[PDB]
Write a protein that binds this ligand. Structure first.
Ligand SMILES: [Ca+2]
Ligand SMILES: [Ca+2]
Ligand SMILES: [Ca+2]
Ligand SMILES: [Ca+2]
Length: 179
């Protein structure tokens, strides 16, 4: 899923187990792989698709589960976001009508379970545009999380920062889906 470096030092991750994550009790079941998320400094790119103010469905977090205009699945979060360029300039910017509809999720306990205060606008974060151009990196960040591909986004002061499609850690019995 698409992650943004908000403070300007690259994308970074944390992990949860027991409460707020993968259950790992040997008595109940077994030890299981810890659930990974973005730092309390950074965030994920999202869109609320039913207007309930929160992220709770598998299409609402941009990644290899979002659908294209014909209803085919996107191959990665960049292909999922590229659908929202209106004019064919290969950037997502305020002249695209979807720019007003995009949000960033900063989860304040990093459980990846959404509350309305955890969502933010692009304009309040000072964002000018997101780039659709990328390069593959396959970079391990920590606790099983891996950045697959990386590009940029731009802030209204004219400065650039990193974004990319981040593979998030989970146990293979639940895969942390937005049920
Ligand atoms: Ca950062
Ligand atoms: Ca929703
Ligand atoms: Ca555009
Ligand atoms: Ca939360």
């Amino acid at each position: 899923p698409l992650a943004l470096d908000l403070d300007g030092d690259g994308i970074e991750t944390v992990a949860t187990k027991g409460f707020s994550g993968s259950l790992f009790d040997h008595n109940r079941d077994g030890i299981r792989t810890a659930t990974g998320w973005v730092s309390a400094d950074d965030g994920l790119l999202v869109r609320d698709l039913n207007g309930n103010g929160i992220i709770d469905n598998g299409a609402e977090l941009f990644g290899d589960n979002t659908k294209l205009a014909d209803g085919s699945f996107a191959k990665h979060g960049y292909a999922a976001l590229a659908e929202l360029d209106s004019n064919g300039d290969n950037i997502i910017n305020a002249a695209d009508a979807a720019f007003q509809s995009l949000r960033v999720w900063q989860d304040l306990n990093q459980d990846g379970i959404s509350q309305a205060n955890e969502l933010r606008t692009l304009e309040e974060l000072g964002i000018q545009s997101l780039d659709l151009a990328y390069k593959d990196v396959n970079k391990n960040l920590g606790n099983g999380n891996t950045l697959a591909q990386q590009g940029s986004y731009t802030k209204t002061n004219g400065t650039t920062a990193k974004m990319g499609d981040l593979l998030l850690a989970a146990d293979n019995l639940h895969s942390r889906f937005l049920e």
